[PDB]
Design a protein around this ligand. Sequence first.
Ligand SMILES: [Mn+2]
Ligand SMILES: [Mn+2]
Lengths: 197, 198
Amino acid sequence: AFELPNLPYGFRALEPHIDQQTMEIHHDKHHNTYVTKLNAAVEGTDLESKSIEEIVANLDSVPENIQTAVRNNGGGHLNHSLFWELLTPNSEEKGTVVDKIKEQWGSLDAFKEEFANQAAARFGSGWAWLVVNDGKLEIVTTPNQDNPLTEGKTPILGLDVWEHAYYWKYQNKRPDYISAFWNVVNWEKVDELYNAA
Amino acid sequence: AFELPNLPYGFRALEPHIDQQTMEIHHDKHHNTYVTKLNAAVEGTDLESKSIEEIVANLDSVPENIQTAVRNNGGGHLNHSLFWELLTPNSEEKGTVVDKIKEQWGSLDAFKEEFANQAAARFGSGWAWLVVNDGKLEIVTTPNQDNPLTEGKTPILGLDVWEHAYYWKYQNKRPDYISAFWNVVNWEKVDELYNAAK
Ligand SMILES: [Mn+2]
Ligand SMILES: [Mn+2]
């Protein structure tokens, strides 16, 4: 059954951009809760055999009695699993995806600008994503723990913009959190998820 | 000319149920942002001077150039305006609505169990409500800053279950925040909202 994956770095590795208090509570309480509630919904069903990607890609096929719980807690597991890996203490703005971004948006900054506007515009709880749609790049956001895989789009970069992702250090200033984020993006992992799609 | 309302008590009045840090930033920054953005959104229109209740009950009528901004910021202004007046340091579990609740749910704490279960279950950002629906009591939750007035139900009690409302004191444990809330409910304001409804 699903386990809370360890972070690939220590709680403090992403300072000063993401504070150790938030990394610890966000990983060990919030993500752990999604794993517990996901397990309680799937265990004793034929969902036990499927990857989270498989489940989230096909939420409409899930039996209605557990669909909401699998949508919310399944989305939660997948989103944070992606997120912990898309962060690094050794961010470098180079690679296959950084190059695709400059051809399409005209520069990395212009892309960041549009990502930031959508990320900030996401009202309430949700995620800002870079996706592949029909082999093209697209900036989308989703509400709560919805994931663009449910709409057949492949996520290659994600930002958590639930208040719990930035309240400790940035309180009500989501745009400053979005700015700090660029400093910790694992562009190696963005390339790997793109090269998969 | 929409305005951030004053708190009718101090930032410490709701301790230890809601912390002074939260009361201060929730009102002074979060609510203030809704009021500022609402005033900006409605500039030049008949919305400038309408009651926020009328506006939110008639979101369908709002021109599409500003509908989302007024849904989000107008609802944030109404919701928080109601919320500050529905909290008090002198909560007493009595009156017209407590009596109707005991008739309908059997007791007040049985009602709290149902309210607490729906308020816990509202996934992501939102509100838990007690509403008047065609003269009857109903518990409902809404997403984000959506308000039951839009669906023709009058809110008489509300609880903010956005993470900002409880994160400083309770972190992930929204149920512990929901239990503390009962200690600071202004049942006199609930009765007044009920009577304005009926
Ligand atoms: Mn999160
Ligand atoms: Mn609030």
